[PDB]
Amino acid sequence: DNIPDFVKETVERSGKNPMSLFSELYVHMTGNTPVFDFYNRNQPNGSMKFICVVILNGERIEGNVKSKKKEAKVSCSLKGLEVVLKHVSEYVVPAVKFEEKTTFFEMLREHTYAKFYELCKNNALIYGFEKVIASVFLKINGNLQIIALSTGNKGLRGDKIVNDGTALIDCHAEILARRGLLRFLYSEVLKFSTEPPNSIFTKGKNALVLKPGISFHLFINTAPCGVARIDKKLKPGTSDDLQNSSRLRFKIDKGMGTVLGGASEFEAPQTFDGIMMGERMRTMSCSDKLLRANVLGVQGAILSHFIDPIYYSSIAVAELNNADRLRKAVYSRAATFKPPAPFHVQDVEIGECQVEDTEQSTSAAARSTISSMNWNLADGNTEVVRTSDGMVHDKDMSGADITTPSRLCKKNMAELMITICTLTKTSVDYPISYEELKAGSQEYAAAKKSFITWLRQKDLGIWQRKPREFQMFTIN
Amino acid sequence: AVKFEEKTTFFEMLREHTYAKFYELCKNNALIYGFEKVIASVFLKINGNLQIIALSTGNKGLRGDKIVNDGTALIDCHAEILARRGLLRFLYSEVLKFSTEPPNSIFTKGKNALVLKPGISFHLFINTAPCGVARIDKKLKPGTSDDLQNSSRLRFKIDKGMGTVLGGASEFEAPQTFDGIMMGERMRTMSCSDKLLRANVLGVQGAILSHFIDPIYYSSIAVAELNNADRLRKAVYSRAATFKPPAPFHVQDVEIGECQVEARSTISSMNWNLADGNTEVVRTSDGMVHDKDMSGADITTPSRLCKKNMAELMITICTLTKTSVDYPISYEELKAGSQEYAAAKKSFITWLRQKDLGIWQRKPREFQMFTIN
Amino acid sequence: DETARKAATQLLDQIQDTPGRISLNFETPEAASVCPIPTSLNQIVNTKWTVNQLQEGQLTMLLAQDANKFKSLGVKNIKKGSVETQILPRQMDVKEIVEKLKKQDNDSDQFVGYAAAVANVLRRCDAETAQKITQAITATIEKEAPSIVNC
Amino acid sequence: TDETARKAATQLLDQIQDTPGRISLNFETPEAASVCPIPTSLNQIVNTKWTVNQLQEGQLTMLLAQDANKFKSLGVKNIKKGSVETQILPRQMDVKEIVEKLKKQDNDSDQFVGYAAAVANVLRRCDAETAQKITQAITATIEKEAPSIVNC
Ligand SMILES: O=P(O)(O)O[C@H]1[C@@H](OP(=O)(O)O)[C@@H](OP(=O)(O)O)[C@@H](OP(=O)(O)O)[C@@H](OP(=O)(O)O)[C@H]1OP(=O)(O)O
Ligand SMILES: O=P(O)(O)O[C@H]1[C@@H](OP(=O)(O)O)[C@@H](OP(=O)(O)O)[C@@H](OP(=O)(O)O)[C@@H](OP(=O)(O)O)[C@H]1OP(=O)(O)O
Ligand SMILES: [Zn+2]
Ligand SMILES: [Zn+2]
């Protein structure tokens, strides 16, 4: 063929058509936008032709001479894509931060992007995913190491829901960062099982506890969706607007924003069949999920069988003026809640980055992307998940898509926990299900129930729980 | 200037009087010069006596990043819509006039609500064809096969742009969200052709004013461009003639008229109202009134036509007429309080969806959750 | 047409004399034909109300008045719970609807697709036709499924 | 700016590029500590033997590669738990009274979700032949009652 197969490979794997892919890659390679030179060829009997010639990297990328502008320009785009994949190189960012100020969170901002671009070196297909990106860092005595890294701003479609837990439900960046943190915590539990000195855990009174000084810090390159975003308006509001601007919100599969609920509105539980019949699945907003994280811990229900609750010590958002309303949304809405005993409402430190208000990038061409990467230190490799169905789409030897569950899905988390239980000789019931395993954490279940009940009784709203059949699958 | 009589010159008379009134206003305030590129007006007619009661200019809308949650910003500043809003303020003034001088008002105590005195009718004039279905697309091809149906579907205005886009796209299936709109999602506002259809179905009075008065309908719509009467009639009446709204409402068969007489994208817009009697200029980008002092500063005031101002006027009306209204109620609940209008609007939107005309693009609930006191 | 010219000039002069107000000359067929208003709006009423009841600043002058001058109107503007739901279903293509109506391996999909297609067909269906479809479906289900749903 | 502070700042910026994802703040000089001040609540200086170098990329993959003999017990017990109801194997096959009500019920402001769910439920439990013969009847009824919807 006159066009290299790598052009088709890039077009297919990037999820972008050749014209859009050429437009994107020309802008990422040089400082200009493709312009087509409409040359014409005349036959002796009279004819009109177009070539739509584009010049790039000093190479003549003259396309096929054809009747109209469309086919000639798309052929020139194909050849220009051949050119951009030739001369192997890609855009990178040097550090541009300021010092001596409150730049610790800015240190977290640069190291998140710097780590992401390092991953792009080994896997070129994740380029451009960093428009919406979150990461988790582990700190001890001034030493910080990135733990989890993820992108994405979209959720599972209602058509693609499954009862076996193989699909990622919410592929927002911070949620996937928390899931990568969960995988890292599982790895650390295993390490404590084999090498207690080298692990971050130590034997507490009733469960594993973090060694002193070890902290976890969440960074998000944009404000989490929900009331942490709805409060961008600096005007304080009048009276009832304060309570109105603090109620729970839920997400739509693809909506870039969130929808406020009501006072006993949406009290009817979601049903699996309803979502399949066409009802839009409701997922709690990332602001409410972060409030839940700072009330109940980030470790989740399953890890509570091994470890004591773990909380984010700080949450950083790449916005210049976010300290007040992010803190309100993330901590203050439940500051008066009293969890049962192992848990507490974490007074998370709120940090602001500098240099760039990142939401310029998060709002441009980030709506188009439908796939999300996730990286964590425990696995050490990147993974791309198509957010529409929330599962990994690899390429077969003979073509067509083969689709496999992500490592962050419910089934894989349950399998990892069962593997740890087998290795550490922990006795578990054979016929348990995913829901029964999570319900097994008595203290965590009680704390979650009390938190939901308190949110209801304080008029904050109704927590939009998923249908029970999302989690009835048996692991063993 | 001058045009030939002996013809169907009633609508040309409307056009001439609208332009004369606008230029009379421009004499009093020269800042509004040049706004008449897209102008609309509402006339009140009794027997052979005609009087202009509302007037407006403008062909743009609110920007997505300038939205507010307290209802102080104008969402759509197209000339047709602001003419209806000025008519709303005029109708408020007439309700108050009835509450004190029943003989001197246009309203009369009906069976269960105020009704117009016999012979009183309202007529809408527009400088150009309303955006959407009523306005012919210079692109594509004349309606054939499936595109014939698309010649009658609902169209949405798009902020930070011009023209109306068709529905049914993958992005337009999802509901509008306040945070989504403000951070960069395109805010969808229904086109003037579909808004005129809603005006012909549920009336021009709106939900809040429907508490006191019976539905009020345009008796005629006049547009200053010819060879398009049938297209305008299809947009505003025909594509909903089969709809059967609840008892107090009906689909008005407006009389479409063409005037004898057959470019600029200025940011500001103006509106005039007989009830107020004074012109008002708003900035269409943010839908707010901008003034100045000591030859500087950017003092900004909500428009008289905004949701908050309409609610305040409504509450003042209720106070003067001693009408009992709940104290903690909000704008969203006040509009929903009118049972008949809410049911009719819900039925109309459902009917539009079922007969495959499109999904009516309702604004996020946060646009109207502000309380009134 | 001498008086037709008179009426035409009177109407033309009226745009400069009292802009925004039109007073057509009725009760004279030759002068009435100068600006023939359309028959759809040609209703003449002997009502005592006239255009002169309308003047600029109407609302401002009414607001700045004693509160004792306003009589009672309709009462009890009671709130109503705004419909909380967004567009509740997801739309799907009619071509996709027909595709799931004809597939017969649906037992592999656990019959979810067929029911979703039926729901989407019924959602875009008018109330009477939807009621008839529901009745027919229930009747044919009862006919062919005794001891399963029928009792 | 002091030479030591500038040196510490340049070291931090260079470490951004040299070892992405790893941050090593410097405390042996209070001037150097002023370059990147940690929040006072986040400082929490504690003497410890653990170091950040104990974290290796892909540690989970290597850890699972070891045989089970090197893993010691954590000293815990895991027991399932009260999941509400059994709402038997999915509150899917819902009790026959619910489908009887849903099929009978007329007010479908629910947007036909419940009725279609009931239709699916009764369809599933019928045998292959019965369910097969019902579906053509349903398709035919849809096609004959509302041709404009389906045959367009
Ligand atoms: O990490 P997320 O994607 O936000 O998932 C969480 C998580 O589910 P996983 O079990 O998948 O981690 C929760 O579980 P906990 O670990 O906190 O117990 C919880 O699940 P439950 O409350 O049901 O135990 C919740 O789900 P729900 O939506 O039901 O509140 C939610 O899942 P979603 O992503 O589905 O929101
Ligand atoms: O003057 P418009 O711009 O056409 O405003 C209307 C109006 O809203 P307000 O009168 O409150 O400004 C409508 O309300 P009704 O008076 O007809 O009840 C309606 O609002 P509802 O649907 O809530 O009734 C609609 O808004 P929507 O787009 O949500 O349909 C629309 O507002 P916009 O054109 O400004 O969107
Ligand atoms: Zn989110
Ligand atoms: Zn318009």
To what resolution in angstroms was this structure determined? 2.8
Cα angle C49, C53, C59 (rounded to 5 degrees) comes to: 130
Q: Identify the helix (H) or strand (E) that includes residue B211.
A: none
Residue A344 in marked binding region:
no
Q: What is the CATH number of domain A5-85?
A: 3.30.160.20
Please report which ligand is nearest the Cα atom of B197. 2
In angstroms, the Cα distances linking B183 to A31, A254, B178 are 27, 15, 9
B67 to each of B180, B286, B332, C3, D49, how far by Cα in Å? 11, 7, 16, 57, 55
How wide is the angle at C-alpha A422 spanned by C-alphas A416 and A426, nearest 5°? 110
Query: Residue D37 falls within a domain, yes or no?
Result: yes
Nearest residue on chain A to D28, alpha-carbon basis: A142
- Length of chain D measured in residues: 152
Q: Evaluate whether B114 touches B211 at the Cβ level (below 8 Å).
A: no
CA distance A18 to A8: 8
Q: Where are the alpha helices (DSSP H) in B29-145?
A: 79-100
A279/C84 Cβ within 8 A: no
d(CA D35, CA D21): 19
- CA-closest candidate to residue C113, choices C122, C103, C123: C103
Comparing CA positions, the residue from B193, B209, B213 lying closest to residue B201 is B193
Interface of D with C in 61-100 (CB under 8 A): 96, 99-100
**Which residue, by CA, sits nearest to atom 18 of ligand 2?**
B207
B108 is written with which tokens? 């009369």
CA–CA separation, A363 and B23 (whole Å): 44
Please name the member of B175, B181, B371 whose beta carbon is closest to the beta carbon of A259.
B175
Collapse the DSSP code of B342 into the 3-class scheme (helix H, G, I; strand E, B; otherwise coil) and give the result. helix
Question: Residues near A166 by Cβ (< 8 Å), separated by ≥ 6?
Answer: A391, A405, A409, A410, A411
Stated length of chain A: 476
Find out whether the beta carbon of B206 lies less than 6 Å from any atom of ligand 2: yes
Contact, A414 vs A219, CB < 8 A? no
Torsion over CA: D70, D76, D77, D78 (sign): negative
Q: How far is CA B347 from the centre of its chain?
A: 20
User: Residue B143, Cβ neighbours under 10 Å: how many?
Assistant: 13
Q: How far is the CA of A47 from the centre of ligand 2 (A)?
A: 55
State the distance from the centre of ligand 4 to the C-alpha of C91, rounded, in angstroms. 28
Give the number of C-alpha atoms closer than 13 A to the C-alpha of residue A2, restricted to the C-beta side.
Answer: 9
Q: Do D119 and C137 touch (CB under 8 A)?
A: yes
User: Ligand 4 centre and the CA of B130: distance in Å?
Assistant: 5
Whole-angstrom distance, CA of residue A32 vs CA of residue A115: 27
Catalytic residue flag (residue A90): no
Q: What are phi and psi of B42, to 5 degrees?
A: -120, 130
Q: Considering its fold, how many domains does chain C have in total?
A: 2
Q: Which of B190, B172, B191, B192 is closest to B180 using CA atoms?
A: B172
Which ligand 2 atom is the nearest neighbour of the CA of B332?
23
Q: A129-142: b or e for each residue (b if 16 or more CB lie within 10 Å)? A: bbbbbbbbbbbbbb
B335 C-alpha to ligand 4 centroid (Å)? 24
d(CA A76, CA A135): 39
| Nearest-angstrom CA–CA distance, D64 and B36 | 76
Is the CB of A181 inside a 6 Å radius of any atom of ligand 1? no
Residue type at position D111? Q
Of B78, B20, B80, B25, nearest in space to B223 by CA: B80
Q: What is the 3-state secondary structure (H, E, C) of chain D?
A: CCHHHHHHHHHHHHHHHHCCCEEECCCCCHHHHCCCCCCHHHHCCCCCCCCHHHCCCCHHHHHHHCCHHHCCCCCCCCCCCCCCCCCCCCCCCCCHHHHHHHHHCCCCCCCCHHHHHHHHHHHHHCCHHHHHHHHHHHHHHHHHHCHHHHCC
Give the span between the Cα atoms of D55 and D71, in whole angstroms. Answer: 18
Question: Which of C133, C143, C147, C151 is the mutation pick for testing D, counting most D CBs within 10 A?
Answer: C133
Q: Measured between beta carbons, which residues in chain A are less than 8 angstroms from residue B178?
A: 230, 257
B74 CA closest ligand 2 atom index: 35
Give the span between the Cα atoms of A7 and A13, in whole angstroms: 10
CA C130, C131, C133, C134 torsion-angle sign: positive
- Which residue type is seen at C47? T
Contact yes or no for B372/B312 (Cβ under 8 A): yes
Q: How many CA atoms lie within 13 A of A140 on its CB side?
A: 20
**Core vs surface per residue A56-83: b (16+ CB within 10 A) or e:** beeeebbbeebeeeeebbbbbbbbbbbb
D122 touches chain C (CB under 8 A): yes
Contact A407, A183 (CB under 8 A): yes
Q: Is residue D116 part of a domain?
A: yes
Query: Contact partners of C by the rule of 3+ C-beta pairs under 8 A?
Result: A, B, D
Is D60 inside any structural domain? no
In a domain, D62, yes or no: no
Residue closest to D136 by CA, chosen among C150, C109, C104: C104
What is the Cβ-side half-sphere exposure of residue A385, based on CA atoms within 13 angstroms? Answer: 32
Amino acid at B251: V
Q: Tell me which DSSP letter residue B225 carries.
A: -
Take atom 36 of ligand 1 and give the residue whose Cα is closest.
Answer: A283
| CA angle A217–A222–A226, rounded 5-degree value | 95
Any atom of ligand 1 within 6 Å of the Cβ of A439: no
Strands A133-140 and A59-60: unpaired
Residue D51 lies in a domain: no
- On chain D, the residues whose CB falls within 8 A of the CB of C97 are 150
Residue B304 is classified by DSSP as T
Instruction: Give me the DSSP letters along C33-89.
Output: TTS---GGG------S--GGG--TTHHHHHHSS-GGG-------B---------S-S
What six digits make up the tokens of B257? 């008229």
Q: Which residue of C has its CA nearest to A253?
A: C90
Chain D residue closest to C109 (CA)?
D124
d(CA A469, CA B269): 55
Q: What is the sign of the dihedral through the CA atoms of B132, B137, B141 and B143?
A: positive
Task: Please identify which residue in the block is written with the tokens 């246009």.
Answer: B106
Instruction: Determine the Cα–Cα distance for residues B368 and B373; give it in Å rounded to an integer.
Output: 14
Could you tell me what percentage of chain B is helix, strand and coil, using 3-state DSSP and rounding each to the nearest 5? 35, 20, 45
Tell me if C107 is assigned to some domain.
Answer: yes
Distance from CA of residue A159 to its chain's centroid?
A: 20
> DSSP states of A160-175 as a string?
G--SSS-S-SB--HHH
Please name the residues in contact with C5: beta carbons below 8 A apart, sequence gap of 6 or more: none
Q: Where are the domains of chain A?
A: 5-85, 104-471
Domain span including residue C1? 1-37
What does DSSP assign to residue A427?
-
- One-letter amino acid of B83: A
Q: Alpha-carbon distance B301 to B291, whole Å?
A: 8
Q: How far apart are CA D9 and CA D26, in angstroms?
A: 10
What is the spatial distance between Cα D59 and Cα A188, in angstroms, rounded to a whole number?
Answer: 9
From the CA of B370, how many Å to the nearest CA of chain A?
Answer: 7
End-to-end CA distance of chain A: 50
Which is nearest to A221 in space by CA: A98, A323, A109?
A: A109
